[PDB]
Design a protein around this ligand. Sequence first.
Ligand SMILES: [Ca+2]
Ligand SMILES: [Ca+2]
Length: 223
Amino acid sequence: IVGGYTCGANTVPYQVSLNSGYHFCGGSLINSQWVVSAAHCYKSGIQVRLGEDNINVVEGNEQFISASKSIVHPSYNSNTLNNDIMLIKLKSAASLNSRVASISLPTSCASAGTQCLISGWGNTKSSGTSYPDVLKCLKAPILSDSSCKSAYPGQITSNMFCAGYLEGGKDSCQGDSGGPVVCSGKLQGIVSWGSGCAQKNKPGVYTKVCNYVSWIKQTIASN
Ligand SMILES: [Ca+2]
Ligand SMILES: [Ca+2]
């Protein structure tokens, strides 16, 4: 998260650190046993780290649950990042509390202008590389589809939306991938991609979770 702020410990209870020996991607806890993340965050041997604030020191609220199974979206295209969403099932149900909570799936798609909370342990620097150990948050509006398309011409599918700022300076970044975009307490987006981080006219592109609630629900229903 570039230009964001320190969330505060466990203020984003659905925030997940996907750990494979290291935090490599974010995720969103959607129920006791399921994390959604970006499909381009897919790896084998994922441990799902819940209740994380500082991903580098054990602070007592962590729940480390390895991934029982990962389900990259069937139509995930790694080249265009279309359908950049993946389901991760925990080996065991998370112990849900005030700090390890699931995030609700969107009934409706959030509109442009809706302010969203993006969070992750990604690079905090637009230029260079500084990885925070504690969760960074960014309040960022969903941008219009036209502004998203004009920012990334020929690249924005109906399954993506842009959030952030066209003047840049505030954006999800590398390492925020798979992380939540929560608007009105609902997981509206997944940190998917962007041309760099916090560049002018290059907002973050996020998986439009509203389009996958069916697929997510049916997948949860049989896995
Ligand atoms: Ca920790
Ligand atoms: Ca990345």
